[PDB]
């Protein structure tokens, strides 16, 4: 819990909630993860199939729209972007299923 | 150049424009990088001070608001978020200067 938030790695010992806060609907609140992923983090057995869509540091700053906001909570680096799935990949349908399984999953459990 | 866009690593031999397209104002374009960073990618002399803000794969999916959009061009994994700078960091002011130099730098390119 010593690392900057953006460098943390969720595991079963330090889960998604502990590292990145509770999933929810608010503007800068994370919304990704079902109960299994939340409690397992990178120990999730299908984590490699999720992480294949996470950007490298170079791609994060190369692809995204980057901004900086000064609010009285502090100075924030904002980011937005989109990553295209390969609809020619034979595994494409399973990729959409896996991502949809975790997007807004928190709505269905406490 | 066959790696998925999100996994590419810009270098002097494969620069930011080649890997991620020219900087611009449209929502689908990246806006980050002056001419030196675009030319050098991860070989840029201040790349470590930029990469310290890039999220881990765990943090990318833990912090961001994630969505899925189907457009005429394909299926896209969307992401938005905000990363707080450390006001207590003795390098804070140099960080603000560095980010200011690269955000929307393309607007003044010859």
UniProtKB/Swiss-Prot annotation, chains A, B:
Region (Putative NLRP3 binding), start-end ranges: 6-86
PTM entry text: ADP-ribosylated. The ADP-ribosylation is retained in the virion during infection.
Superkingdom per UniProt: Viruses
Coiled-coil features, chain-numbered ranges: none
Location of the protein in the cell: Virion; Host cytoplasm; Secreted; Host extracellular space
Motif Nuclear localization signal: where in chain: 2-10
Domain CoV N CTD: 1-110
Chain intervals for the UniProt region annotation (Dimerization): 4-107
Subunit structure: Homodimer, homotetramer, homooligomer with RNA. Both monomeric and oligomeric forms interact with RNA. Interacts with protein M. Interacts with protein E. Interacts with NSP3; this interaction serves to tether the genome to the newly translated replicase-transcriptase complex at a very early stage of infection. Interacts with host NLRP3 and ABHD8; these interactions disrupt the association between NLRP3 and ABHD8, increasing NLRP3 stability, ultimately leading to increased inflammasome activation.
Protein family membership: Belongs to the betacoronavirus nucleocapsid protein family.
Role description: Packages the positive strand viral genome RNA into a helical ribonucleocapsid (RNP) and plays a fundamental role during virion assembly through its interactions with the viral genome and membrane protein M. Plays an important role in enhancing the efficiency of subgenomic viral RNA transcription as well as viral replication. Attenuates the stress granules formation by reducing host G3BP1 access to host mRNAs under stress conditions.
Protein name, per record: Nucleoprotein
Species of the source: Severe acute respiratory syndrome coronavirus 2 (2019-nCoV)
Underlying gene: N
